[PDB]
Design a protein around this ligand. Structure first.
Ligand SMILES: [K+]
Ligand SMILES: [Mg+2]
Ligand SMILES: [Mg+2]
Ligand SMILES: [Mg+2]
Lengths: 985, 31
């Protein structure tokens, strides 16, 4: 629909043939979805596996090696050789493909996190009377959609009717208007008008700041205002994490030093260039020792270390989502394992938000100035209308008490919520606010008129007794809740009439703070008597006792205005006269309701203790109840002293600032606070360098969620509060936060053990190739042999590391320090110490066959250093058998073997093998065998060993490879040992 | 997810198919 904003409101409905009252029928939706398509942008998806391997072969080093190989073959044509350039390519192509799959799976996984929370909108369609919450991509033009405060607007929408006094919208992401703007519903005559002047439209991707409204969808998909903009570009933020840079810089540093050592190996040979390689023509001598130099370069320059950070993320964030922690900001995953304080809200995060009225009272006798109370309890704590009203633990019929009748009448009419039976889950579920639906179930359980419900079905039984009260009193309007009075009320009139605009009542429900001052009378049965001091004090005293004990009940005060003002004399635009509309009240009773602790919170808070993480409840109960709840869930002790560890927001506002900063250091419970207080707290905690995770759900939580180190939004919450956040909890659970923090720590250790493996494996490669030249030895490894080993390790054991378990005793440690360097000075030692051993061993293996080997040439302490020409016969009276495949097949062997051993070493950062055995990761064990079966493959086949220049090894030879390799596990175990105890690691 | 074990198996396949081609290139150039 074009220029909806210029068409009037009847005209938009008319254009699509849709009713405001019902919405699109199922058919209309199909037709319009056929015609306009989904509310999406087309999936771009432009990349290919073919292209990416080619794109990998565009860096210089890889081309150079291929050039060196080509040239070497052409030159020595005069008299493999040729297979070398071909197998180099193949291995490089092999390694490339593996590296591409690696990279792309990681990208897709990260991108897939968006699937855990699809954009949703609310529509009205004809097949259900209620509002429906559908995936937004299934919203079509002509849909009647609904928006309210906190929502992210699902399509371009003409506004139909403003349910508030004001609708107020944040369209900054669109128009740049940083402040919120207001909207109306009259038409904007100019068709060519500019977005900011369409004060009657709500554009897609835009937040609502205040208000509720109903509209008709005019355009979806690319046709939207933001669609036109999003279609141009991306527009991709394009990385990278702060840790990714700190480690990137270390990559640059290291990469440099490897370049220097790679040039330096060339110059060791620069005098050897004319020795027969052969017979030492300078160009052939040059290019040979230059394949080596650049081979080591390509194979050992590390590599894509940010690739490692963007893989542990992809693994870990997947895990967190499967555990209800949906990560929005990837940077925060690093700082998550640093969390040191968690402020959490109570209702529905530490508790469960399953309300249930489970005590209640009304007035009994009233003698002079004192009163008796009639006081009952109710069983059943789900929403199911199954349970009984007891008195003195004796079941009783609630209608026998006229006071109870009126208390139930109030709970049915001051209610905007309802019960619905879920025939698929087979359970009674809520519709609307939990605290209200708890009143709904109570009226069902009470059944004050004794209507015949035993024989109805679950579905019709679900609101049976409530419907009878409505059949009795017509609710005409509602005086919506306001803070100035802490109550709400409904103006009802009697069922049957013929004008007759009289007989009426107002039923008022709210907090005792608000309601009681406004009661002049007390209802005793059906009679009424003057409210007085000791009566007031008596009611209050019981509300207190219920708050501070055992089940800690939040209480509602229910009252009635027996002679309300005339319908003609009331006005609902300004909320602030309702406290005077609700005066001259008559007290009726009190409902007290339960909101049970989460089942896993108590044990969760204990885990935060073990892991040095402070937990701070921020609730809205009065202080007394709040503290009772903290004791119940283990924040406080059964008899702990806390007159300085828990604050009312008002109490907190009278401490000088000096002492507010103080309180925040010891406080674990804040009650009845303002949204301003969330930021205030974060500020103070920040001054002690504490990493704070704050929860939130409403638009007003946005500032503190932004300001916190880690903002954590409720999934049941608002779109507005989630954008502010780094994590969304799918299940609103506190325990989810702690599992998030644990995985944070787990991922970080997995990063640390990934890179320890990459660096030490690369360092050894550099060492052996260096020693073999610096000492004047024969090449322990042909360039071809290197890339092979490097292919196998990056493909099997390296990948297999991603599937490690969380390190042990990971939360019996305190929070990591922010700014604690990623690579400790000490740690770099291990990278070198282990790495050196690899290189030392691999050449120490080639050196061994050349000396102490019984089937080898006895050269004990004799110069293998001696120049490879060696036909002179000055120390040999043989002669050039130095080009044997045997020495290399120990070098290649020890290398391949150590790489596996040093992979077992990468199971934990500090933890031993006798504590985290080789079999903690089977995939690793699997991969080692898979590797080992290839090494054994290229060894024995017979065509291939000629290309790889290798000879078989008997059980006499593979033995030594144990004695040479295995102590790398010894060595690292020693290193790890010094760590665990001395290093405090 | 068992997508992890598939990832490792598919890696092992490539470096096997790679080693295969060289057995195929040896005989091919030989005759
Ligand atoms: K934040
Ligand atoms: Mg490399
Ligand atoms: Mg809350
Ligand atoms: Mg490698």
């Amino acid at each position: 629909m074009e220029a909806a904003h210029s068409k009037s409101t009847e005209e938009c409905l008319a254009y699509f043939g849709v009713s405001e009252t019902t919405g699109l029928t199922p058919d209309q939706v199909k037709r319009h979805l056929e015609k306009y398509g989904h509310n999406e942008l087309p999936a771009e998806e432009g990349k290919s596996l073919w292209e990416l391997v080619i794109e990998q072969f565009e860096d210089l080093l890889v081309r150079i090696l291929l050039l060196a190989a080509c040239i070497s073959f052409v030159l020595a044509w005069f008299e493999t050789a040729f297979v070398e350039p071909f197998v180099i390519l193949l291995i490089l192509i092999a390694n490339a493909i593996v590296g591409v799959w690696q990279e792309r799976n990681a990208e897709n996984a990260i991108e897939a996190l968006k699937e855990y929370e699809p954009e949703m909108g609310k529509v009205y369609r004809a097949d259900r009377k209620s509002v429906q919450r559908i995936k937004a991509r299934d919203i079509v033009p002509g849909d009647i959609v609904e928006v309210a405060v906190g929502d992210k607007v699902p399509a371009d929408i003409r506004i139909l009717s403003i349910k508030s006094t004001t609708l107020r919208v944040d369209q900054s992401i669109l128009t740049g208007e940083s402040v919120s703007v207001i909207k109306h519903t009259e038409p904007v005559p100019d068709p060519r008008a500019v977005n900011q002047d369409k004060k009657n439209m709500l554009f897609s991707g835009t937040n609502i700041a205040a208000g509720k409204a109903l509209g008709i969808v005019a355009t979806t998909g690319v046709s939207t205002e933001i669609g036109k903009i999003r279609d141009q570009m991306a527009a991709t933020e394009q990385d990278k994490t702060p840790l990714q840079q700190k480690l990137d810089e270390f990559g640059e540093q290291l990469s440099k030093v490897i370049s220097l050592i790679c040039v330096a190996v060339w110059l060791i040979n620069i005098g050897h260039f004319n020795d027969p390689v052969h017979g030492g023509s300078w160009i052939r001598g040059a290019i040979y020792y230059f394949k080596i130099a650049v081979a080591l370069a390509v194979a050992a320059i590390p590599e894509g270390l940010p690739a490692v950070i963007t893989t542990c993320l992809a693994l870990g964030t997947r895990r967190m989502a499967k555990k209800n922690a949906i990560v929005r900001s990837l940077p925060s995953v690093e700082t998550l394992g640093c969390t040191s304080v968690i402020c959490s809200d109570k209702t529905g995060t530490l508790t469960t938000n399953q309300m249930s009225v489970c005590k209640m009272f009304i007035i009994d006798k009233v003698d002079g100035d004192f009163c008796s109370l009639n006081e009952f309890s109710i069983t059943g704590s789900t929403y199911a209308p199954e349970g009984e009203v007891l008195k003195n633990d004796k079941p009783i019929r609630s209608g026998q008490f006229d006071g109870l009748v009126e208390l139930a009448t109030i709970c049915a009419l001051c209610n905007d919520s309802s019960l619905d039976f879920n025939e698929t889950k087979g359970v009674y579920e809520k519709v609307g606010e939990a605290t209200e639906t708890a009143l709904t179930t109570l009226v069902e359980k009470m059944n004050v008129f004794n209507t015949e419900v035993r024989n109805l079905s679950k579905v019709e039984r679900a609101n049976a007794c409530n419907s009878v009260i409505r059949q009795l009193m017509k609710k005409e309007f509602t005086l919506e809740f306001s803070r100035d009075r802490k109550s709400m009320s409904v103006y009802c009139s009697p069922a049957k009439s013929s004008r007759a605009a009289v007989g009426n009542k107002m039923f008022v429900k709210g907090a005792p703070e608000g309601v009681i001052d406004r009661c002049n009378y007390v209802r005793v049965g059906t009679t009424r008597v003057p409210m007085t001091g000791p009566v007031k004090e008596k009611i209050l005293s019981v509300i207190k006792e219920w708050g501070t004990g055992r089940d800690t009940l939040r209480c509602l005060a229910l009252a009635t205005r027996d002679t309300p003002p005339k319908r003609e004399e009331m006005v609902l635009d300004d909320s602030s006269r309702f406290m005077e509309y609700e005066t001259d009240l008559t007290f009726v009773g009190v409902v007290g309701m339960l909101d049970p602790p989460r089942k896993e919170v108590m044990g969760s808070i204990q885990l935060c203790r073990d892991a040095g993480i402070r937990v701070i409840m921020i609730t809205g109960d009065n202080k007394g109840t709040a503290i009772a709840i903290c004791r119940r869930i283990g924040i406080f002790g059964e008899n702990e002293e806390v007159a300085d560890r828990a604050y009312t927001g008002r109490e907190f506002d009278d401490l000088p600032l000096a002492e507010q900063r103080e309180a925040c250091r010891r406080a674990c419970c804040f009650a009845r606070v303002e949204p301003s207080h969330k930021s205030k707290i974060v500020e103070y905690l920040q001054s002690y360098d504490e990493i704070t995770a704050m929860t939130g759900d409403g638009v007003n939580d946005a500032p503190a969620l932004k300001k916190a180190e880690i903002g954590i939004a409720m999934g049941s919450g608002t779109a507005v509060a989630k954008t502010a956040s780094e994590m969304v909890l799918a299940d609103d659970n506190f325990s989810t936060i702690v599992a998030a923090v644990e995985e944070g720590r787990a991922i970080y250790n997995n990063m640390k053990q990934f890179i320890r493996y990459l660096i030490s494996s690369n360092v050894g490669e550099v060492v052996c190739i260096f020693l073999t030249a610096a000492l004047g030895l024969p090449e322990a490894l042909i360039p071809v042999q290197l890339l092979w080993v490097n292919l196998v390790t990056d493909g099997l054991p390296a990948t297999a590391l991603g599937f490690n378990p969380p390190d042990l005793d990971i939360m019996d440690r305190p929070p990591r320090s922010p700014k604690e360097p990623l690579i400790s000075g000490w740690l770099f030692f291990r990278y070198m110490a282990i790495g050196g051993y690899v290189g030392a061993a691999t050449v120490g293996a080639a050196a061994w066959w050349f000396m102490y080997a019984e089937d080898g040439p006895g050269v004990t302490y004799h110069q293998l250093t001696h120049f490879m020409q060696c036909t002179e016969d000055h120390p040999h009276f043989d002669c050039e058998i130095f080009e044997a495949p045997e020495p290399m097949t120990m070098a290649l062997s020890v290398l391949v073997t150590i790489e596996m051993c040093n992979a077992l070493n990468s199971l934990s950062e500090n933890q031993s093998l006798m504590r985290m055995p080789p079999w903690v990761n089977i995939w690793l064990l699997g991969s080692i065998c898979l590797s080992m079966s290839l090494h054994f493959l290229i060894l024995y086949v017979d065509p291939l060993p000629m290309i790889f220049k290798l000879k078989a090894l008997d059980l006499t030879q593979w033995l030594m490879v144990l004695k040479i390799s295995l102590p790398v596990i010894g060595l690292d175990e020693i290193l790890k040992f010094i760590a665990r105890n001395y290093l405090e690691g | 997810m068992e997508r992890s074990t598939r990832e490792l198996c598919l890696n092992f396949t490539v470096v096997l198919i790679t080693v295969i081609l060289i057995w195929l290139l040896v005989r091919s150039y030989q005759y």
